[PDB]
Design an enzyme around this catalytic site. Structure first.
Site, PDB file in Angstrom:
ATOM      1  N   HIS A  42      -0.122  -4.955   4.505  1.00  0.00           N
ATOM      2  CA  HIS A  42       0.952  -5.045   5.494  1.00  0.00           C
ATOM      3  C   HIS A  42       0.451  -5.041   6.939  1.00  0.00           C
ATOM      4  O   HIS A  42       1.224  -5.319   7.869  1.00  0.00           O
ATOM      5  CB  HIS A  42       2.036  -3.990   5.248  1.00  0.00           C
ATOM      6  CG  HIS A  42       1.648  -2.595   5.607  1.00  0.00           C
ATOM      7  ND1 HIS A  42       1.201  -1.685   4.664  1.00  0.00           N
ATOM      8  CD2 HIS A  42       1.728  -1.916   6.776  1.00  0.00           C
ATOM      9  CE1 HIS A  42       0.977  -0.525   5.246  1.00  0.00           C
ATOM     10  NE2 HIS A  42       1.283  -0.636   6.530  1.00  0.00           N
ATOM     11  N   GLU A  73      -1.374  -3.950  -2.256  1.00  0.00           N
ATOM     12  CA  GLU A  73      -1.385  -3.552  -0.843  1.00  0.00           C
ATOM     13  C   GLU A  73      -2.799  -3.357  -0.338  1.00  0.00           C
ATOM     14  O   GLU A  73      -3.023  -2.663   0.651  1.00  0.00           O
ATOM     15  CB  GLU A  73      -0.540  -2.297  -0.568  1.00  0.00           C
ATOM     16  CG  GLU A  73       0.867  -2.551  -0.076  1.00  0.00           C
ATOM     17  CD  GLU A  73       1.010  -3.622   1.024  1.00  0.00           C
ATOM     18  OE1 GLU A  73       1.520  -4.730   0.716  1.00  0.00           O
ATOM     19  OE2 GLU A  73       0.640  -3.323   2.169  1.00  0.00           O
ATOM     20  N   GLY A 147       1.109   6.646  11.811  1.00  0.00           N
ATOM     21  CA  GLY A 147      -0.267   6.213  12.168  1.00  0.00           C
ATOM     22  C   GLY A 147      -1.363   6.398  11.120  1.00  0.00           C
ATOM     23  O   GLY A 147      -2.550   6.178  11.417  1.00  0.00           O
ATOM     24  N   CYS A 149      -1.861   4.792   8.203  1.00  0.00           N
ATOM     25  CA  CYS A 149      -2.200   3.691   7.305  1.00  0.00           C
ATOM     26  C   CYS A 149      -3.662   3.244   7.392  1.00  0.00           C
ATOM     27  O   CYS A 149      -4.257   3.128   8.470  1.00  0.00           O
ATOM     28  CB  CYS A 149      -1.216   2.513   7.386  1.00  0.00           C
ATOM     29  SG  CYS A 149       0.304   2.915   6.450  1.00  0.00           S
TER      30      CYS A 149
HETATM   31  C1  LIG Z   1       1.426   2.936   7.881  1.00  0.00           C
HETATM   32  O1  LIG Z   1       1.487   1.555   8.252  1.00  0.00           O
HETATM   33  C2  LIG Z   1       2.757   3.394   7.296  1.00  0.00           C
HETATM   34  C3  LIG Z   1       2.666   4.890   6.854  1.00  0.00           C
HETATM   35  C4  LIG Z   1       4.076   5.500   6.976  1.00  0.00           C
HETATM   36  C5  LIG Z   1       4.256   6.898   6.442  1.00  0.00           C
HETATM   37  O2  LIG Z   1       3.343   7.446   5.767  1.00  0.00           O
HETATM   38  N1  LIG Z   1       5.451   7.481   6.754  1.00  0.00           N
HETATM   39  C6  LIG Z   1       5.775   8.831   6.316  1.00  0.00           C
HETATM   40  C7  LIG Z   1       7.233   8.981   6.822  1.00  0.00           C
HETATM   41  C8  LIG Z   1       7.308   8.054   8.054  1.00  0.00           C
HETATM   42  C9  LIG Z   1       6.488   6.817   7.598  1.00  0.00           C
HETATM   43  C10 LIG Z   1       7.359   5.645   7.118  1.00  0.00           C
HETATM   44  O3  LIG Z   1       7.738   4.984   8.083  1.00  0.00           O
HETATM   45  N2  LIG Z   1       7.702   5.310   5.812  1.00  0.00           N
HETATM   46  C11 LIG Z   1       8.576   4.144   5.421  1.00  0.00           C
HETATM   47  C12 LIG Z   1       8.103   3.350   4.138  1.00  0.00           C
HETATM   48  N3  LIG Z   1       8.110   4.198   2.953  1.00  0.00           N
HETATM   49  C13 LIG Z   1       8.645   3.805   1.766  1.00  0.00           C
HETATM   50  O4  LIG Z   1       9.200   2.726   1.576  1.00  0.00           O
HETATM   51  C14 LIG Z   1       8.557   4.731   0.614  1.00  0.00           C
HETATM   52  C15 LIG Z   1       8.880   4.357  -0.767  1.00  0.00           C
HETATM   53  C16 LIG Z   1       8.624   5.494  -1.396  1.00  0.00           C
HETATM   54  C17 LIG Z   1       8.766   5.747  -2.870  1.00  0.00           C
HETATM   55  O5  LIG Z   1       8.188   6.475  -0.610  1.00  0.00           O
HETATM   56  N4  LIG Z   1       8.125   5.936   0.712  1.00  0.00           N
HETATM   57  C18 LIG Z   1       6.667   2.908   4.330  1.00  0.00           C
HETATM   58  O6  LIG Z   1       5.804   3.767   4.176  1.00  0.00           O
HETATM   59  N5  LIG Z   1       6.328   1.638   4.705  1.00  0.00           N
HETATM   60  C19 LIG Z   1       4.985   1.161   5.024  1.00  0.00           C
HETATM   61  C20 LIG Z   1       4.825  -0.318   5.451  1.00  0.00           C
HETATM   62  C21 LIG Z   1       4.806  -1.317   4.294  1.00  0.00           C
HETATM   63  C22 LIG Z   1       4.016  -1.123   3.160  1.00  0.00           C
HETATM   64  C23 LIG Z   1       4.047  -2.081   2.133  1.00  0.00           C
HETATM   65  C24 LIG Z   1       4.870  -3.211   2.235  1.00  0.00           C
HETATM   66  F1  LIG Z   1       4.903  -4.095   1.239  1.00  0.00           F
HETATM   67  C25 LIG Z   1       5.656  -3.406   3.380  1.00  0.00           C
HETATM   68  C26 LIG Z   1       5.617  -2.462   4.412  1.00  0.00           C
HETATM   69  C27 LIG Z   1       4.488   2.031   6.148  1.00  0.00           C
HETATM   70  O7  LIG Z   1       5.315   2.203   7.065  1.00  0.00           O
HETATM   71  N6  LIG Z   1       3.238   2.558   6.178  1.00  0.00           N
END
Ligand SMILES: *[C@@H](O)[C@@H]1CCC(=O)N2CCC[C@@H]2C(=O)NC[C@H](NC(=O)c2cc(C)on2)C(=O)N[C@@H](Cc2ccc(F)cc2)C(=O)N1
EC number: 3.4.22.29
Length: 182
Positions: A42, A73, A147, A149
């Site tokens: 992503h 991913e 932050g 990721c």
């Molecule tokens: C780094 O780019 C980021 C890490 C985000 C993270 O750890 N967070 C903890 C809480 C705040 C964020 C967050 O924004 N989470 C939203 C989303 N999470 C989920 O969908 C989810 C599903 C389940 C089960 O538990 N959580 C998320 O983490 N999105 C990713 C971006 C992404 C990843 C893969 C894709 F195909 C598309 C987009 C993210 O924000 N990661």
């Protein structure tokens, strides 16, 4: 932690991590060996990225998928740069597993290299991450942040995954398997 698990992580950061900048922001990148780095898919790296702020051509890249075409991913990049990474493939597991007492090694978006204890990790299967099916997840119960990721999930002598998402209670990494890189 100031002992061996933290120390292995700090060495891993110093020798095998970098900050990758794409149009989607800054990610921790794991250098696997030579000019190969992995980043979360992503991050959407293009033909040029920054590596530690240095504009760098991507010689080739490819996304990884499971047996049914579901994204893992993980994206592999081969970088056009002189520096070679120390080969850490022998630390990458052959198989899916659960792991007690893991840490996350963070570089991007942190004021300084940071080691977090995320606790016990389980092989969780497929999830929906921001609505998208994602396979071969490792799950931990830790309040991860935006932050994080690319953060490297590890134990002493074991490089297990890269952080790809979470919901405030649970965090998820893409599993690293040695066969991806050999
Ligand atoms: C780094 O780019 C980021 C890490 C985000 C993270 O750890 N967070 C903890 C809480 C705040 C964020 C967050 O924004 N989470 C939203 C989303 N999470 C989920 O969908 C989810 C599903 C389940 C089960 O538990 N959580 C998320 O983490 N999105 C990713 C971006 C992404 C990843 C893969 C894709 F195909 C598309 C987009 C993210 O924000 N990661």
């Amino acid at each position: 932690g100031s002992g061996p698990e933290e120390e292995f992580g700090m060495s891993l950061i110093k020798h095998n991590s970098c900050v990758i900048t794409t149009e989607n922001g800054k990610f921790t990148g794991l250098g696997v060996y030579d000019r190969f780095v992995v980043v979360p898919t992503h991050a959407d790296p293009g033909k040029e990225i920054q590596v530690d702020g240095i504009t760098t051509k991507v010689i080739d890249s490819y996304d990884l998928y499971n047996k049914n075409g579901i994204k893992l991913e993980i994206t592999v990049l081969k970088l056009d740069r002189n520096e070679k990474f120390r080969d850490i493939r022998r630390y990458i597991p052959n198989n899916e597993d659960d792991y007690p007492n893991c840490n996350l090694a963070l570089l991007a978006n942190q004021p300084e290299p940071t080691i977090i204890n995320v606790g016990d990790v389980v092989s969780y299967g497929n999830i929906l991450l921001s609505g998208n099916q994602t396979a071969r997840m490792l799950k931990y119960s830790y309040p991860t942040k935006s932050g994080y990721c690319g953060g490297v999930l590890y134990k002493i002598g074991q490089v297990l995954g890269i952080h790809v998402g979470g919901n405030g209670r649970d965090g998820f990494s893409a599993m690293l398997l040695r066969s991806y890189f050999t």
